[PDB]
Design a protein around this ligand. Structure first.
Ligand SMILES: CC(=O)N[C@H]1[C@H](O[C@H]2[C@@H](O)[C@@H](NC(C)=O)[C@H](O[C@H]3[C@H](O)[C@H]4N=C(N(C)C)O[C@H]4[C@@H]3CO)O[C@@H]2CO)O[C@H](CO)[C@@H](O)[C@H]1O
Length: 386
């Protein structure tokens, strides 16, 4: 058996990447010129370029460096990934025969100009939108299928067409017609992370934790559960890459009450209460993580600031059921508080073992700039036999 290792790089530096350890490199992000009224990026509002791909100056400069990287690994495939969390424009781009043709024409132009091997679409998310951050409509689901079918017909034979899809149970069931789009995609990147929300402690647990259990049923996610949901929806295992996050998250449960929305009196009667005080929030703020804005910490920052804290305020632990590491910090009363879960070489190796045991097509990871001296990608490549 052979396996993929599909590495994303958030470039929009790139020379520190060891591309000998991956089969595919996705450069992130291309954006989409769009007319969504809430768009705040002034560069995307050019009406003469509506529905085309926007490349910032840094993105253009980095894409021109790709022939250098190709020398280091002549087998490497390089794609541009368009979209990302918060990226507007897909709903409109996919909506009509006119808009789709503009977008496809732009994809073809970018692949030719920068000698890319293909394109990755990272739409977060069709139908659902994303809590007011991108426009959506129920027609997104059928329109996404049309866009991918028309992209497949337009792309030169052999160029790659891939997508990234969300962990949410509703993605294969309601948002994306996975059986309908499977004929058009070389592989599908499952974003099997970002689970440390609501009442769940862990961000990318492989299985459910018993020691640190998720309280509300609708929050009970694991990478295994996500894979099973896409398989049950009809995707074949060889077409799937299990996504691995080179980062961790402080769970929302540490700082926000957790709601079980299956309760009739849900909003006023939380089932979990926050356990961070201002003391713990200030510790993270002083290290660059403002928990009022976001909750993630890159793996290299976990290593430098948390695992190697001079005053050893963070203690590393292993959850044998979730198969991922986590850190605790001591409260003012000296009690352990669950601070952050993440991925380390041991847990990355167990996810590669899982890939092999299930016959998945490979691994994907987000993102290479957050690795610690390429150690997580190296472990992934070793465990997968890359
Ligand atoms: C809309 C938004 O919030 N934008 C912010 C962006 O936000 C980033 C960031 O939140 C990143 N999170 C992590 C953990 O790195 C996420 O990263 C996510 C990608 O957008 C998704 N796509 C993939 N793929 C395709 C594998 O993984 C997913 C990844 C992890 O959740 O991208 C966003 C951009 O789109 O971050 C920078 C840096 O603080 C901010 O100035 C701001 O631009």
């Amino acid at each position: 058996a052979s396996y993929l290792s599909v590495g994303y790089f958030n470039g929009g530096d790139i020379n520190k990447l060891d591309v000998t350890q991956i089969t595919h490199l996705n450069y992130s992000f291309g954006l989409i010129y769009n007319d969504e009224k809430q768009e705040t990026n002034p560069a995307l509002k050019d009406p003469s370029r509506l529905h085309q791909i926007y490349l910032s100056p840094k993105v253009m400069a980095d894409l021109q460096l790709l022939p250098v990287l190709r020398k280091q690994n002549p087998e490497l495939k390089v794609l541009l990934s368009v979209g990302g969390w918060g990226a507007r424009g897909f709903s409109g781009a996919a909506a009509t025969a006119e808009s789709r043709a503009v977008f496809i024409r732009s994809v073809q132009q970018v692949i030719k100009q920068y000698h890319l091997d293909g394109i990755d679409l990272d739409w977060e998310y069709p139908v659902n939108g994303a809590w007011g951050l991108v426009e959506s409509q129920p027609a997104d689901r059928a329109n996404f299928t049309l866009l991918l079918a028309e992209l497949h017909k337009a792309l030169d034979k052999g160029k790659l067409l891939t997508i990234a899809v969300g962990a949410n149970v509703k993605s294969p069931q309601e948002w994306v017609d996975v059986k309908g789009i499977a004929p058009y995609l070389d592989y599908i990147n499952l974003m099997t992370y970002d689970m440390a929300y609501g009442t769940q402690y862990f961000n990318s647990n492989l299985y459910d934790s018993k020691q640190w259990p998720t309280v509300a049923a609708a929050d009970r996610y694991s990478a295994n559960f996500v894979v099973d949901n896409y398989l049950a929806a009809g995707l074949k295992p060889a077409q799937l890459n299990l996504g691995i996050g080179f980062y961790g998250r402080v769970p929302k449960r540490a700082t926000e009450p957790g709601i079980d929305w299956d309760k009739a009196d849900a909003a006023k009667n939380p089932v979990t209460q926050p356990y961070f005080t201002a003391r713990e929030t200030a510790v993270f703020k002083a290290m660059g993580l403002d928990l009022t804005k976001d909750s993630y910490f890159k793996y290299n920052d976990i290593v430098s600031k948390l695992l190697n804290d001079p005053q050893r305020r963070f203690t590393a632990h292993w959850d044998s059921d979730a198969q991922v590491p986590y850190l605790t910090m001591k409260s003012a009363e000296g009690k352990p508080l669950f601070a952050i879960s993440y991925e380390n070489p041991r847990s990355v190796a167990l996810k590669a073992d899982y890939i092999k045991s299930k016959g998945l097509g490979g691994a994907m990871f987000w993102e290479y700039g957050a690795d610690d001296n390429n150690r997580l990608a190296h472990q992934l490549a070793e465990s997968l036999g890359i």
